[PDB]
Design a protein around this nucleic acid. Structure first.
Ligand SMILES: [Mg+2]
Ligand SMILES: [Mg+2]
Ligand SMILES: [Mg+2]
Ligand SMILES: [Mg+2]
Ligand SMILES: [Mg+2]
Ligand SMILES: [Mg+2]
Ligand SMILES: [Mg+2]
Ligand SMILES: [Mg+2]
Ligand SMILES: [Mg+2]
Ligand SMILES: [Mg+2]
Ligand SMILES: [Mg+2]
Ligand SMILES: [Mg+2]
Ligand SMILES: [Mg+2]
Ligand SMILES: [Mg+2]
Ligand SMILES: [Mg+2]
Lengths: 83, 151, 116, 188, 66
RNA sequence: UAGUCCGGAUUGGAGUCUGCAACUCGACUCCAUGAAGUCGGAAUCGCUAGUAAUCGUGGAUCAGAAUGCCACGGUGAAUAC
RNA sequence: AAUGCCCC
RNA sequence: CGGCACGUAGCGCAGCCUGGUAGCGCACCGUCAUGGGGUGUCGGGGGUCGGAGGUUCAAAUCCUCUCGUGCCGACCA
């Protein structure tokens, strides 16, 4: 986990995008690629299409997701089973 | 080895009594190169043995070894389709060394509390002709006796 | 010999005795004994009842079996419902902290299941 | 001792013909056109254990016998006799040398072995198919130059001799099949 | 109540850490020491601390903010 | 003399550091948790003296990332008919 | 002087 | 047609009499040995009794009916 004194990390393009979203009050799927950003309270309720390699998986941010990072919710390998 | 006979290396006598064979015994007992630990163990066991026995540590140890020592032992050869078991007499130094080894192994086997206590019980029982070490001596003599037909 | 809803062994020293509680290890136990002014060499046998009541006070100041397992399970369940990576990992029963799974995952995968 | 007629008994019955218990193993009834009916029974002499062949006449017939088998459990041997017991009646019983022929080396103690008793008296004991036994004597196997499996002769705590692979030494319990007299596994 | 059948059953004192003494008839034989009785059990002041609901966004904004 | 004051795997929570950035995938720390394991089947490996065995230390690579690799010393044996 | 088959 | 004795793991057989557990050999799976294959050694897994209805506390087993496969003769006219 990142050091505490540094504060939580987030990409500035994602920051500007989510500010634009919350000021437009529009439910558009926010496409992104930053699986390293940390989910912020200002994103609760937003539908973020985050990258996983192949394509963009849509995640709906809930009150609980405020700690994790978008990579937690974009799974990146596909495993069905061995038989 | 194939080519040469070799000379034996010298061992300094034990510090407390100054005896080559007790030095050999503590060496045999040692593991991991913890000579100090082996020495503490063997001297504690020797102290309590002398207590139980009366007579001094040297003669107590010597009678235990006299009881555990083998005279003739066996070796296998696999002559034809059936393997053999040839009884060959045991040269002194070897009988002493493997007697000490049998004793320390019986001690490791015995389940008492401490290693010193195990070794002490083992030495006393061997001095009085009992215990797995002297039983192994019996078994060695018995095999050899059985296969005496070979020479 | 009975604290925080568990019976405690009565001959072992107080530190180990309190570690026998779920939610109290060695350092937490030493903290308990210090805060209650009880020595460590003493066993639960030969210990007055007011002392054991102080011990109960301290262990209640901490969080223990009932509350602890409820917290643990609620957290695990929160993960598994969130459905984050740790969530899927918990649900499928594989190492969560990032260990390898190509081999050597037997603590999470139990004994080996031969292919048939 | 209800008398049994030839075209009546199928396999399993224990007929008593000629002062001797038997056991019908198989039987073929024939009713040809124009002649007396008969049965070709594949009998089994129940004392020496040899299979006899008897063509019986519809009419020709024999009394039954009290030959029965159930699960007794071996207890002990003393002199020339072997004693066994039931687990549902706990009735004591004693056999003799004849009954235990070549199964002496297979029974140890507490083995649950089927026995055939006749006249309320055993005549033949069947050792459990697999018995766990310990080896009294072996030659320490040395691979030497062996290129094939080799095998090794090994006496057992009951006298028997079996070929054990190479490693079984002394004091190791093995498993042998009484039926074939052969090593199956070294029971750890 | 038959005579020799049933076990002994006498008045026994029960003292807890709540500071309440209780005269009870029971089969315990000797006296009795309690750790928790009814009136002291954390059952009426525990329904919140034994659940510990909390809130993650509150935890986060307390941890740090803009 | 106990699955233990052995063993530390696994997991929960909380942190430090490097680095734009530790989700996938770092290392380490604190609290709790305390699996398997009670000496290892057939088979198999290294070693003849400061050697084996055991105990620590350093270096290269490298921001971070070794139980690997390359070195260093401490204790220090058995046996070779 | 037990066993020891074969290599497109 | 009857009577009759079978139907049990991939194959071949036990068990069933005398109700409570399904066993044996080969095969099959994974090591080991070997330059590699085999023989061999060490370990593992697999069926629920052709089907249905009864008796029973409970049926592979006892009854009865069905399906399938073998064997015997279905003769004097
Ligand atoms: Mg003796
Ligand atoms: Mg011995
Ligand atoms: Mg800890
Ligand atoms: Mg890793
Ligand atoms: Mg132990
Ligand atoms: Mg480091
Ligand atoms: Mg265990
Ligand atoms: Mg080598
Ligand atoms: Mg050399
Ligand atoms: Mg090292
Ligand atoms: Mg190092
Ligand atoms: Mg460096
Ligand atoms: Mg060194
Ligand atoms: Mg060929
Ligand atoms: Mg006519």
């Amino acid at each position: 986990p990142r050091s505490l004194k540094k504060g939580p990390f987030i990409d500035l393009h994602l920051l500007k995008k989510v500010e634009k979203a919350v000021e437009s009050g529009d439910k558009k799927p926010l496409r992104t690629w930053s699986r390293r950003s940390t989910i912020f309270p200002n994103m609760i309720g937003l539908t973020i299409a985050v990258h996983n390699g192949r394509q963009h998986v849509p995640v709906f941010v809930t009150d609980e997701m405020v700690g994790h990072k978008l990579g937690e919710f974009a799974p990146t390998r596909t495993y069905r089973g061995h038989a | 080895p194939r080519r040469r006979v070799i000379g034996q290396r010298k061992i300094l006598p034990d510090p407390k009594f100054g005896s080559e064979l007790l030095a050999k015994f503590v060496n045999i007992l040692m593991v991991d190169g913890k000579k100090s630990t082996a020495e503490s163990i063997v001297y504690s066991a020797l102290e309590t043995l002398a207590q139980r026995s009366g007579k001094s540590e040297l003669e107590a140890f010597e009678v235990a070894l006299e009881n555990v020592r083998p005279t003739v032992e066996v070796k296998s050869r696999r002559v034809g389709g059936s393997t053999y078991q040839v009884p060959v007499e045991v040269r002194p130094v070897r009988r002493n060394a493997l007697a000490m080894r049998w004793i320390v192994e019986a001690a490791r086997k015995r389940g008492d509390k401490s290693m010193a206590l195990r070794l002490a019980n083992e030495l006393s029982d061997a001095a009085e002709n009992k215990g797995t070490a002297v039983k192994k001596r019996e078994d060695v003599h018995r095999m050899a006796e059985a296969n005496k037909a070979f020479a | 010999a009975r604290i925080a809803g568990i019976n405690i062994p009565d001959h072992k020293h107080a530190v180990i005795a309190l570690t026998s509680i779920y939610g109290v290890g060695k350092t937490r136990s030493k903290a308990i004994l210090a805060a209650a002014g009880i020595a460590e060499d003493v066993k639960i046998s030969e210990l007055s009842e007011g002392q054991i009541d102080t011990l109960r006070d301290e262990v209640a100041k901490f969080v223990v079996e009932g509350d602890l397992r409820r917290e643990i399970s609620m957290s695990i369940k929160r993960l598994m419902d969130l459905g984050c990576y740790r969530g899927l990992r918990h649900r499928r029963g594989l190492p969560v902290r990032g260990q390898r799974t190509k081999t050597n995952a037997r603590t999470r995968k139990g004994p080996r299941k031969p292919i048939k | 001792m209800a008398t049994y007629y030839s075209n009546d008994f199928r396999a399993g019955l224990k007929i008593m013909l000629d002062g001797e218990p038997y056991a019908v193993e198989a039987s073929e009834f024939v009713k040809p056109g124009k002649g007396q009916a008969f049965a070709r029974v594949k009998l089994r002499r129940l004392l020496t254990g040899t299979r006899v062949e008897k063509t019986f006449k519809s009419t020709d017939s024999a009394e039954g016998a009290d030959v029965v088998d159930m699960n007794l459990t071996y207890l002990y041997n003393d002199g020339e006799f072997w004693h066994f017991m039931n687990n549902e009646t706990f009735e004591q019983l004693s056999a003799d040398a004849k009954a235990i022929g070549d199964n002496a080396k297979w029974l140890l103690d507490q083995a649950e072995c089927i026995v055939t008793l006749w006249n309320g008296q055993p005549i033949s004991v069947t050792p459990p198919n697999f018995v766990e036994l310990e080896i009294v004597d072996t030659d320490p196997g040395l691979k030497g130059d062996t290129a094939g499996t080799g095998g090794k002769p090994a006496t057992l705590s009951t006298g028997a001799v079996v070929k054990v692979p190479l490693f079984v030494q002394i004091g190791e319990v093995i498993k042998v099949d009484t039926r074939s007299g052969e090593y199956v596994s070294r029971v750890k | 109540m038959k005579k020799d059948i049933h076990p002994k059953y006498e008045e026994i004192t029960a003292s807890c850490s709540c500071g309440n003494v209780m005269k009870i008839r029971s089969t315990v034989g000797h006296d009795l020491n309690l750790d928790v009785c009814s009136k002291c059990h954390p059952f009426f002041t525990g329904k919140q601390r034994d659940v510990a609901t909390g809130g993650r966004v509150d935890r986060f904004n307390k941890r740090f903010n803009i």
